[PDB]
Amino acid sequence: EKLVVQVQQLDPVKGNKDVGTVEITESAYGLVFTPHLHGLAQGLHGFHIHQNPSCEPKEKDGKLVAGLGAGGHWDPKETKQHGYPWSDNAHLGDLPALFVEHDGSATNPVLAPRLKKLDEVKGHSLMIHEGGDNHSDHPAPLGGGGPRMACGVIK
């Protein structure tokens, strides 16, 4: 009847810290992602489900870049393109952008109409990027979210 994702802000060098959680429920129109995050940068952020059920980084050129353990966006239907949460051409893991209040709190729930059961999302990660999401691979790849600001494993 529910799923509570332990969301933590990413940081390879010093350490991961718990920013709150995200509960995933089923509605008659798809999975609902309701967060109770506190202490994040304000604004709209890219919100997507990734491949590997891990939130640990991967260094490159010495410079460790957070969240790479998660891999790319979850794409079991191999569309090979980033898009809208309501488009069949998009990665199945593409969710609506997440809003973080002026006080760093995320409490506005979003719907992923293409996901029906809680089981589908298990064994994958939940990523929250630094930038937004224009739901296209242009002008920037993967909606332009960029650096991975927060993450959590869906168990």
Smallest gap from Cβ 83 to Zn ion, in A, equals: 7
Task: Please tell me what DSSP assigns to residue 120.
Answer: H
Partner whose binding site includes residue 82, from its own copies, Zn ion, Cu ion, none (CB under 5 to 8 Å by kind): Zn ion
d(CA 150, CA 129): 7
Cβ distance to Zn ion smaller for residue 57 or 145: 145
Partner whose binding site includes residue 30, from Cu ion, Zn ion, its own copies, none (CB under 5 to 8 Å by kind): its own copies
Instruction: State the residue for tokens 């979003």.
Output: 110
Tokens of 42: 């304000």
Site for its own copies in 68-97 (CB under 8 A): 84-88, 96-97
Tokens of 127: 């990523």
* 3-state secondary structure at position 40: coil
Smallest gap from Cβ 87 to Zn ion, in A, equals: 11
> Which residues lie below 8 Å from residue 74, measured CB to CB, with a gap of 6+?
48, 49, 50, 51, 91, 92, 93, 124
Smallest gap from Cβ 84 to its own copies, in A, equals: 7
Does the annotation list 124 as a binding residue? no
112 and 154 in contact (C-beta within 8 Å)?
Answer: no
User: Which residues here bind its own copies, judged by CB under 8 A?
Assistant: 27-30, 32, 42-44, 84-88, 96-97, 99, 101-102, 108-111, 113-114, 132, 135
Detail the residues annotated as belonging to a binding site.
Answer: 48, 50, 73, 82, 91, 94, 129
